[PDB]
Amino acid sequence: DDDDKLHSQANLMRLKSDLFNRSPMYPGPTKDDPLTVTLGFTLQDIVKADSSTNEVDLVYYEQQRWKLNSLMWDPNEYGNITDFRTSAADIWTPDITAYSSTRPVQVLSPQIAVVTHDGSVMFIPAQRLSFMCDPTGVDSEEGATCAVKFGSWVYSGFEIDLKTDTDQVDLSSYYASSKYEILSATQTRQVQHYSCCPEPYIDVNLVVKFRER
Amino acid sequence: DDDLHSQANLMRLKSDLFNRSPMYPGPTKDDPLTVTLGFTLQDIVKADSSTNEVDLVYYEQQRWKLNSLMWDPNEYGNITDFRTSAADIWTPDITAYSSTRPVQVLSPQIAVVTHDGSVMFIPAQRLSFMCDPTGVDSEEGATCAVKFGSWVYSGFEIDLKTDTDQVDLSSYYASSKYEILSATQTRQVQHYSCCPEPYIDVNLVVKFRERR
Amino acid sequence: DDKLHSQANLMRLKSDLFNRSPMYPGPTKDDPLTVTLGFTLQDIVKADSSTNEVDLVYYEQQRWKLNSLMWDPNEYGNITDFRTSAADIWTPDITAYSSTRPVQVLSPQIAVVTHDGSVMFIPAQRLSFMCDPTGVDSEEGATCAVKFGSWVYSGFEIDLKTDTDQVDLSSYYASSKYEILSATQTRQVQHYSCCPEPYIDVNLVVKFRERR
Amino acid sequence: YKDDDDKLHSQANLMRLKSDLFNRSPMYPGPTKDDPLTVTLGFTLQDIVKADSSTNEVDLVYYEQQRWKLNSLMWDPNEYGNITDFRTSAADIWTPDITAYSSTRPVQVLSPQIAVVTHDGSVMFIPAQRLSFMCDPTGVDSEEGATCAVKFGSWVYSGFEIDLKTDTDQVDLSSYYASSKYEILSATQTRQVQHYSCCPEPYIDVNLVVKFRERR
Amino acid sequence: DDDDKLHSQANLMRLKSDLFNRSPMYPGPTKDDPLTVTLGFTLQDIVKADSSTNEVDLVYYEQQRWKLNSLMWDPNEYGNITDFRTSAADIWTPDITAYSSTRPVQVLSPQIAVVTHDGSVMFIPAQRLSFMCDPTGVDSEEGATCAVKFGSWVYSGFEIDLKTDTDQVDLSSYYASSKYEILSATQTRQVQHYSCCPEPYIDVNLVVKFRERRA
Ligand SMILES: CC1=C([C@@H]2C[C@H](C)C(=O)O2)CC[C@]23CCCN=C2CC/C=C(\C)[C@@H]2O[C@@H](CC[C@H](O)/C(C)=C/[C@@H]13)C[C@H]2C
Ligand SMILES: CC1=C([C@@H]2C[C@H](C)C(=O)O2)CC[C@]23CCCN=C2CC/C=C(\C)[C@@H]2O[C@@H](CC[C@H](O)/C(C)=C/[C@@H]13)C[C@H]2C
Ligand SMILES: CC1=C([C@@H]2C[C@H](C)C(=O)O2)CC[C@]23CCCN=C2CC/C=C(\C)[C@@H]2O[C@@H](CC[C@H](O)/C(C)=C/[C@@H]13)C[C@H]2C
Ligand SMILES: CC1=C([C@@H]2C[C@H](C)C(=O)O2)CC[C@]23CCCN=C2CC/C=C(\C)[C@@H]2O[C@@H](CC[C@H](O)/C(C)=C/[C@@H]13)C[C@H]2C
Numbered sequence A: 001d002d003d004d005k006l007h008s009q010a011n012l013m014r015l016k017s018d019l020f021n022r023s024p025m026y027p028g029p030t031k032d033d034p035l036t037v038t039l040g041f042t043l044q045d046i047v048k049a050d051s052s053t054n055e056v057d058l059v060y061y062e063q064q065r066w067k068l069n070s071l072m073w074d075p076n077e078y079g080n081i082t083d084f085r086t087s088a089a090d091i092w093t094p095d096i097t098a099y100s101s102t103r104p105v106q107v108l109s110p111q112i113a114v115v116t117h118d119g120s121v122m123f124i125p126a127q128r129l130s131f132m133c134d135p136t137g138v139d140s141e142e143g144a145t146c147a148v149k150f151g152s153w154v155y156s157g158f159e160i161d162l163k164t165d166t167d168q169v170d171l172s173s174y175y176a177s178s179k180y181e182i183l184s185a186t187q188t189r190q191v192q193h194y195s196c197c198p199e200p201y202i203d204v205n206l207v208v209k210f211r212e213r
Numbered sequence B: 001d002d003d004l005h006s007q008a009n010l011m012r013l014k015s016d017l018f019n020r021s022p023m024y025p026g027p028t029k030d031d032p033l034t035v036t037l038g039f040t041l042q043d044i045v046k047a048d049s050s051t052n053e054v055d056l057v058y059y060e061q062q063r064w065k066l067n068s069l070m071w072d073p074n075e076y077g078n079i080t081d082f083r084t085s086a087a088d089i090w091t092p093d094i095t096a097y098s099s100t101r102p103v104q105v106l107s108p109q110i111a112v113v114t115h116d117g118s119v120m121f122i123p124a125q126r127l128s129f130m131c132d133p134t135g136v137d138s139e140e141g142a143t144c145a146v147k148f149g150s151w152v153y154s155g156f157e158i159d160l161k162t163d164t165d166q167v168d169l170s171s172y173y174a175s176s177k178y179e180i181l182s183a184t185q186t187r188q189v190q191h192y193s194c195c196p197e198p199y200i201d202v203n204l205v206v207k208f209r210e211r212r
Numbered sequence C: 001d002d003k004l005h006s007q008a009n010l011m012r013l014k015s016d017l018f019n020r021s022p023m024y025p026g027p028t029k030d031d032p033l034t035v036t037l038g039f040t041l042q043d044i045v046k047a048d049s050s051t052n053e054v055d056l057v058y059y060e061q062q063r064w065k066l067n068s069l070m071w072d073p074n075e076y077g078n079i080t081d082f083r084t085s086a087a088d089i090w091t092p093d094i095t096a097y098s099s100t101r102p103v104q105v106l107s108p109q110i111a112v113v114t115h116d117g118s119v120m121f122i123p124a125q126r127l128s129f130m131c132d133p134t135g136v137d138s139e140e141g142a143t144c145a146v147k148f149g150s151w152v153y154s155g156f157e158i159d160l161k162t163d164t165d166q167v168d169l170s171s172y173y174a175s176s177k178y179e180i181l182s183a184t185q186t187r188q189v190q191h192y193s194c195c196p197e198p199y200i201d202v203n204l205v206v207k208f209r210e211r212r
Numbered sequence D: 001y002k003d004d005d006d007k008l009h010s011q012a013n014l015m016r017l018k019s020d021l022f023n024r025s026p027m028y029p030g031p032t033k034d035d036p037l038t039v040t041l042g043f044t045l046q047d048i049v050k051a052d053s054s055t056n057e058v059d060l061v062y063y064e065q066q067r068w069k070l071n072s073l074m075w076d077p078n079e080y081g082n083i084t085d086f087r088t089s090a091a092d093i094w095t096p097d098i099t100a101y102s103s104t105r106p107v108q109v110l111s112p113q114i115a116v117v118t119h120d121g122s123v124m125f126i127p128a129q130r131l132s133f134m135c136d137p138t139g140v141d142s143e144e145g146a147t148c149a150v151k152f153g154s155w156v157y158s159g160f161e162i163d164l165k166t167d168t169d170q171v172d173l174s175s176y177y178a179s180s181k182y183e184i185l186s187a188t189q190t191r192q193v194q195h196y197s198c199c200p201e202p203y204i205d206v207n208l209v210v211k212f213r214e215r216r
Numbered sequence E: 001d002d003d004d005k006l007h008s009q010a011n012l013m014r015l016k017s018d019l020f021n022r023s024p025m026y027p028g029p030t031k032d033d034p035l036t037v038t039l040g041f042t043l044q045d046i047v048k049a050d051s052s053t054n055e056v057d058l059v060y061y062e063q064q065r066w067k068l069n070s071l072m073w074d075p076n077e078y079g080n081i082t083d084f085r086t087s088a089a090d091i092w093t094p095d096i097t098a099y100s101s102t103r104p105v106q107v108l109s110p111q112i113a114v115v116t117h118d119g120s121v122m123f124i125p126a127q128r129l130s131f132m133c134d135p136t137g138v139d140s141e142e143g144a145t146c147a148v149k150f151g152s153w154v155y156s157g158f159e160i161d162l163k164t165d166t167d168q169v170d171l172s173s174y175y176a177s178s179k180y181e182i183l184s185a186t187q188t189r190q191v192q193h194y195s196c197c198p199e200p201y202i203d204v205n206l207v208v209k210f211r212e213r214r215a
């Protein structure tokens, strides 16, 4: 019967209620309860390289994945619901930031995440980013090389650790008719040491080598 | 008192729907939703050959049906139909896949709800998307394409469809810098490595050239 | 100390109207609302022939009248009108049909409600819209038009009219880059193959040229 | 231990005062013909950033001083441990709807939107703004320069509800940017009255007239 | 077995809850309760120098630091937690403003502060700022000199004592491939009085000498 649809809605509603409007929520990672965030970029386009200001504009998808015990559930208690979509405001998200942007990142996609019964969150914002990049050599065979680091703004490696599944930037969705073609693009986790601080900070360094098509 | 009874019936209905009964948490695998999508292309504003971006203005017609929004007009003084702010209901997360700037909304964010639980939502939008306008200065013109789909829902939660593969050009701006040779909107089913579920988009293909 | 009671009188009035009473949920077929619309054209700021976009600054006068906003001044210390945030009341969704960028509001979003139930709301706006400015550098000038109308209501709900078909030019900026040769605002009735209901818009037609 | 004991008492008093003003008393409904308000307006001109002769728009940067007084914001400092004034977000109080009448773009606020309220009920509010307004800069490349003007007034209130006032007709140029592309020859702010056919009430504005030339 | 982690989260929720729900929140600095705010700059890039409007665009990190008794806790009472991060909207923050910006500041970093057990708040927004600056001489060896002041918009020196750790601007992460190189950058505390009024107003003057790069 079509009543099974009404039972599906009630089960989701109760699940969300149990995880948000009842269970003690998430204050962010701690030194004793650290969090690993998996990061990966899908480079869609180099829109603009500005040699009068040394800014380059990228469009990319930033894939983020982390896992919380306070988001786990048994699907058997909720009509075998295995995953659900929720607004990215309802849950805690990591403060992953580009370290050398020259204006605020523009969000191209709806700020919605996917939560899975094991406590997995997948969040993949499409973004347009202006960052510090000298495009000298872009009109040559060798091309120009630029880099931008992404990491937490406020957490050290003892609270947020970063990892990549791979060192290769996903280029399978690169705009085939861009003004610029990619010679190579890598994403490398770096354990970074600052003079201020005994504890290391983790970033992912995005190195893009490119030239005019 | 004729007016006052029709206003009270509307406020009662909106209450029953939006102060009860109880909520709507989006589509699921067991409770999937059909969103029908259609485009009315008004203008190609700008084709920047220095960055390969093209700016479109269009209306995006979205229609879907929720049982939680159904009512019997007989219970509410023959109200078959009402207007509501789009912030007050669930709407689908239909997104352009290759935009270069956040989409800019041109129209009031208001939807119409019919007693059959059907929702009609038609935002007007300006979109910048990835498009190489090479050839636009010629008789063959340039061809550009952009896909629209849910960002987060798969084909098992939202079934995207169209009523036609023909973009509505009946209000394309007659004095645009660009004339439309053709504009089509096509449903495609796509799979990604990570994931068993299908993902559905509508591909909008526009062929265009500079107006004489 | 009437100054103290003057405040409590207005406080009580706003309470009685916004609380106490059944809410006004907008117009319906059962209860159509006449909305009067008129433009005061202040400046043609910019005419872009690369994109066929023209930028206007104008005041958009909106006027309508409601039973649920009427009161007797004697009951409220001789108060005959009050100011209120436009966010606190229903306002009409009058939209440019061919803008190219979201309209930018230049004035505080505040309306004036009078005891006879009439609302005055006059947003100052900057609008980019579809206009071919060819011939602006000549004596005959260029001619462009843009239609304003409700996005979601038909003529059965919003009975849209103008008080005059002449655009107010009494404060068009005397040192503008462009001079106005004429500006008219004309109500039109249109029909669509979806809908039995008539649809109404106001067509702002501006003829203009480079000042010399 | 009268260290952070005085400090605790002073913090508690401040929070007691704000609570007594913004919770124990009904929300201020704005001025009326029987309870009218006088807003005192003065400008501090900081910079003429740009003069665009292809659109006839000029961009100004200035501080707009606004001051007014309300009985509902008065208090006795003795009942609140000698507190004479406090700072508050502009959003937590009523502020007048003073608007430029010939802007071509929405004003951009450069400063934090915070006001200062004094025990006599007076409020000081000084937002820094960038403004694009209608201005023909022909003459800017001359000795007498170019002259432009922009009126400021309430958008929805007549002079019977919000009266507008200046302390002086001289614009404050003591903070004008000395390396600006444009130098100021004069800047005045003059109160004006008129009537409209709609209404019997006087309508008031302050006309900011600026005379300027290219600095060389 | 090991869910002393449960727990670790419980301790932090309890702490934030104790500081934000069970104790009176700070109402801001006052005459009788003045605050010391320490301000410091890390210059990242001079993006753009516009000679037709006399505007220059800077990207910098603005270090802000202050200390409240009401944000102190005993780490022993909360499972040894010595610090936590929290949205900047949750706490009071200083209204430090550039005095000569020509566009509203743009924040580039998430608005999150770090609070330590002694009542310390560290808050470091990355910002892009357009300000008033005549870049004449930027194409020469001497370079051009520009300056911009930062201070409280609404508080006098009787409520906020503005301070620096040092007069040298941090250049250790200045973008090496910038269009402009830095010759010098100083941050100086200034006390000003206005004929208007008896209270002093404190600011930090950022003075940057810079020129076009020749790399
Ligand atoms: C210098 C610095 C960089 C530099 C900038 C350049 C593009 C780069 O690659 O690393 C990236 C952002 C980062 C390094 C990564 C962590 N965050 C910042 C700036 C924000 C710092 C905050 C909020 C507080 O100071 C942090 C340590 C202070 C440290 O000296 C500091 C300011 C580091 C910051 C920890 C935290 C308590
Ligand atoms: C690669 C990709 C595209 C590409 C871009 C190009 C224009 C195209 O045609 O498809 C459009 C958006 C989409 C495909 C359509 C659905 N969403 C995305 C990106 C957002 C993805 C989110 C939130 C989650 O990851 C998805 C994994 C699928 C896949 O690897 C992935 C990131 C697909 C995304 C499932 C979903 C739970
Ligand atoms: C085609 C159309 C135009 C055109 C564009 C051109 C400048 C013109 O003159 O009219 C302007 C906006 C309008 C004109 C009529 C009112 N609204 C629209 C688009 C928005 C429509 C919505 C939200 C729903 O469809 C409406 C009827 C559908 C109709 O075919 C339709 C799409 C009309 C729209 C009613 C309402 C339930
Ligand atoms: C004509 C006009 C101007 C003109 C524009 C030019 C730069 C000037 O100096 O005055 C600036 C804004 C103002 C002048 C006075 C303040 N209001 C406006 C526009 C907004 C008006 C509203 C909301 C209602 O009409 C007002 C009076 C009607 C009057 O004819 C009217 C529309 C005046 C408006 C009062 C109020 C009830």
Ligand SMILES: CC1=C([C@@H]2C[C@H](C)C(=O)O2)CC[C@]23CCCN=C2CC/C=C(\C)[C@@H]2O[C@@H](CC[C@H](O)/C(C)=C/[C@@H]13)C[C@H]2C
Pocket (backbone or CB within 6 Å): D063, D116, D124, D125, D126, D175, E099, E100, E149, E151, E152, E153, E154, E155, E156, E194, E196, E197, E201
């Ligand atoms: C004149 C002035 C400047 C100028 C600009 C130039 C770069 C400079 O060094 O000082 C920068 C901002 C400041 C100086 C420091 C305090 N803030 C302002 C402007 C905002 C002032 C407000 C909100 C109220 O008046 C303040 C004191 C009045 C004082 O005369 C005044 C208007 C000072 C303001 C305190 C407060 C109650």
